[PDB]
């Protein structure tokens, strides 16, 4: 029954929020729908794999809150393998490259590629992180899909293909599905195209030793009986002095306040009294999550390394089940594995096959891309289709279709009487990620501390000291990168010289 | 506790399903979340208005199923007033017109307008009503918004503005929010642009005497105590011999089968065991409903008729709160009134205002458009904002954003084990309308009859004889309408 704050959801954001409230002397209860904590993070343990992340996994520089929280819980990170060459596979052929991104040799094509990334970052700087709908061209950009924007910016098919793969991999959705204003915000609030797309010095630099699921598990340990598993929340009543929160097994919880730390659309699974105000009522029907199957194929050895390939592949083409891979070998060098994502429409399409049929398609692809028959000899396989999760809705995160973020975006984290909103979707820095889950969790917790008269207003939002274990190198551009013309810019220069 | 079929939702679709099954001899319960039946239809009664439809209201030729069901319940229609001239309000002036659609005088603009309606119907001819994802160009049309399609097709701002208003009014959503495939299907499955937009001989021809809310009320009267009000469903368990359906007030129901007669996305409000299959699990987070406030301003007399205006107004522009109106005066000539809809982003914007502030804006608009100070003296006002409704999600109906219909469309009415799917959104003719609700409820009821062995497969989908009271005249086009070139076509001849 009675407590100070009920937290709905025991994923990273809920658990971080509960921890902060608990550490400040409040009595907190966490109501988790599933028979486990973690949510969109989930670490499988068995003897074949030892451990493996089937949900959220990567952390990197500038993600200072998740790093601090994990370190305080006694966790360590290790570096994803990027020693040897990356591979860009396009038009049925493989092109090895070192450095973060595939080199472009054709000068016209180079101009177009350079301009594209540059412009995304240029547009992004127009977009406030904490209020994307305040960008000067918010409406114009929101009324357009990412597909339209690409068709306008990209004067070569090469640039358009690469841009498309970039969108698909960043947000597990198709370019025609998403708002351009939202996608531009999403990249900017992770610190730009380079930071989001990179391994070394970017979002994919590291994983946790033992798996990310430990974050939520270790917080559960600290809280003890306060976390209630298999308690899906079905009903919230705010008509009386204390908030009443009811679960599916008919248990009743009474609190002063509530944090909702679930994906915004899953708010639909809860019946509200009084009804939600109109903007929130409609917003939660407008905000789907992306589609992805995470797949890990195990080998006797990380044989790609011997061919001077790190295991990173960027794979273009409709026929490829997987569009990107990373080496998922353990830091000690054993349990050789390749991790790959089946994305957006391919997740839907390939879900119809058996596990054994998906494994076969992946190996045949890896064998072609790596030029290696050994890829046809897997020793084990694990996968998770997040699209089938009643209590997630999809992965990685929530996307906004055209027109939604300007009309409804301002209510995402607006309180509803005594209900406050956490969950990575409400973050302002690495929203969509484990980092954003911690930011939103702790911010929602501090909103309540402020409402109770425990902290001043200026302390709701709190800046984070930079990790000393995972330093951020700045993102830099060369002079040519800054000032080279676009394709039409070059065409203008040509017409002008015709005098 | 125990019965043959649980129907979730007591709107028209659920009521029609429950009535059909009950007439077959089966034991039915209807579980309804609200303290009332009707859902997206709702008839308010008070002395000032007598009665008024604050939700779904209009019916017209080709809507044979809603007309038959209502006739059986003892209801009658009357004709929406369209005797006098319609008004098109453009760049701050009123251009009265007779005939269904506002005339265009500039020759270039005329060609652009003409080509646009014609092209919409032409495209719809390649879209199958019962499987729009099977259109030959399905992916291409689904990957574009209606805003992109209008940008390609319309060489004039005039056409593009009127096409935009058309989209806004039909589906209470912005051109950039919706898939081109889905919107083209939507119009085609209502019989085309003329049929969907027309009062005389179209969807807006008629209203029910005493209100559409009576259809659901009278089926509830028929079903006695089988309708359970204030029973929102929260949990459905299919793991056992009988389906178990639990409600929020902790009641338990048990049945051989289930009909879901609620808006698809409102499926999210129910926890399932076992989990729903993947495609439905995601589909139901991908299908929002539109945004509308319905508003009725009452006057002492229908004063517009004296100026030879019927009350129908089409109003261009961002400044207007309402883009279209109809006469809402009762058949007797009393309770004089104008109905208007506040649509899409305007519903969102103007919801912040008070009721009285909305009344003022409407009255000043109508005064300008009708050219009468009499519009400034309302005797009464009623409105309903459907955006606030937890158990509707919006009005009129569900729209599909780009990419959704091709990827998820086929799952909408696919049965999940012992759950069958009703609700206007699953209909194949006038989906989105009261008519679609009856089509879908009855079909979902017959799917269950066939699963039970009581009827053969070829009886699941049943045709409907044409109403004698509301017969349909054919949709015609003139020779010039068919063969005049588009703007780029006239350019190619130059
Ligand atoms: C799925 C996924 C996510 C992901 C990714 C790859 C995949 C396949 N890769 C990532 C990565 O490499 N690095 C990273 O930082 N993030 C990555 N992501 C995203 C990341 O996993 C998520 O952003 C993060 O896990 C989300 O945390 P958050 O705490 O905000 O949200 P949640 O995990 O979904 O937890 C919500 C919990 O609430 C429970 N729930 C749902 N409904 C109810 C009700 N009605 N009542 C009670 N509890 C409820 C859920 O069960 C869940 O535990
Ligand atoms: C809102 C609206 C609708 C409308 C319109 C104008 C407005 C402002 N104009 C129309 C018109 O002029 N002509 C016409 O034919 N249609 C018009 N529309 C749309 C029309 O009203 C709808 O297509 C139709 O009413 C929909 O019927 P349907 O039976 O398919 O669906 P519903 O009315 O929403 O009924 C659903 C019921 O289910 C209940 N519910 C919801 N969730 C639950 C749960 N969890 N458990 C139990 N019951 C639930 C709802 O409360 C509702 O009663
Ligand atoms: C191998 N290469 C070049 C790349 C390039 C960009 C990438 N972007 C991501 C963005 C988010 C994410 N999550 C798991 C959230 C995973 C990845 S993996 C990834 C791999
Ligand atoms: C007055 N004129 C010319 C028009 C033209 C088209 C129209 N379209 C509608 C479409 C649906 C609808 N509903 C209430 C669902 C109402 C209307 S009102 C309407 C009025």
Curated annotation (Swiss-Prot), chain A:
GO terms for cellular component: mitochondrial envelope; mitochondrial outer membrane; mitochondrion. The record marks 154, 363, 380 as: Important for catalytic activity. Changing residue 384 to M: No loss of activity. The modification S-8alpha-FAD cysteine is found at residue 395. One of its GO terms (biological process) is substantia nigra development. Inhibited by deprenyl. Residues 1-487 are cytoplasmic. It is found in: Mitochondrion outer membrane. Its cofactor is FAD. Pfam families: Amino_oxidase. This is Amine oxidase [flavin-containing] B.
């Amino acid at each position: 029954n009675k407590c100070d704050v009920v937290v709905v959801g025991g994923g990273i954001s809920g658990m971080a929020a509960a921890k902060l409230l608990h550490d400040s002397g409040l009595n907190v209860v966490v109501l988790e729908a599933r028979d486990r904590v973690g949510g969109r993070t989930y670490t499988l343990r068995n003897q074949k794999v030892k451990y493996v992340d089937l949900g959220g996994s990567y952390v990197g520089p500038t993600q200072n809150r998740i790093l601090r929280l994990a370190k305080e819980l006694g966790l360590e990170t290790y570096k994803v393998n990027e020693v040897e060459r990356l591979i860009h596979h396009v038009k049925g052929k493989s092109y090895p490259f070192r450095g973060p991104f595939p080199p472009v040799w054709n000068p016209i094509t180079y101009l177009d590629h350079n301009n594209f990334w540059r412009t995304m970052d240029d547009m992004g700087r127009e977009i406030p992180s904490d209020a994307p709908w305040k960008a000067p061209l918010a409406e114009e950009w929101d009324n357009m899909t990412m597909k339209e924007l690409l068709d306008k910016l990209c004067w070569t098919e090469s640039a358009k293909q690469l841009a498309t793969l970039f969108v698909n991999l960043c947000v597990t959705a198709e370019t025609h599905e998403v708002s351009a204003l939202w996608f531009l915000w999403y990249v900017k609030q992770c610190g730009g195209t380079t930071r989001i797309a990179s391994t070394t010095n970017g979002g994919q630099e590291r994983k946790f030793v033992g798996g990310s699921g430990q974050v939520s598990e270790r917080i559960m340990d600290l809280l003890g009986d306060r976390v209630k598993l298999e308690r899906p929340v079905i009903y919230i009543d705010q008509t009386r002095e204390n908030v009443l929160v009811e679960t599916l097994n008919h248990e009743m919880y009474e609190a002063k306040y509530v944090i909702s730390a679930i994906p915004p659309t899953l708010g639909m699974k809860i019946h509200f009294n009084p009804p939600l105000p109109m903007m929130r009522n409609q917003m939660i029907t407008r905000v789907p999550l992306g589609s992805v199957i995470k797949c890990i194929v195990y080998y006797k050895e990380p044989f790609w390394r011997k061919k001077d390939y790190c295991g990173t592949m960027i794979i273009d083409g409709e026929e490829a089940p997987v569009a990107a891979t990373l080496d998922d070998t353990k830091p000690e060098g054993n349990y050789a594995a390749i991790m790959g994502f089946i994305l957006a429409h391919k997740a839907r399409k390939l879900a119809r096959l058996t596990k054994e049929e998906r494994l076969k398609k992946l190996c045949e692809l890896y064998a072609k891309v790596l030029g290696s028959l050994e890829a046809l000899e897997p020793v084990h396989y694990e996968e998770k289709n997040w699209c089938e999760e009643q209590y997630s809705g999809g992965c990685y995160t929530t996307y906004f279709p055209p027109g939604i973020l300007t009309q409804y975006g301002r209510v995402l984290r607006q309180p509803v009487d005594r209900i406050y909103f956490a969950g990575t979707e409400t973050a302002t820095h690495w929203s969509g990620y484990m980092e954003g889950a911690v930011e939103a969790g702790e911010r929602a917790a501090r909103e309540i501390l402020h409402a109770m008269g425990k902290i001043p207003e200026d302390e709701i939002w709190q800046s984070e000291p930079e990790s000393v274990d995972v330093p951020a190198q700045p993102i830099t551009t060369t002079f040519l990168e800054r000032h080279l013309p676009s394709v039409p810019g070059l065409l203008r220069l040509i017409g002008l010289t015709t005098i």
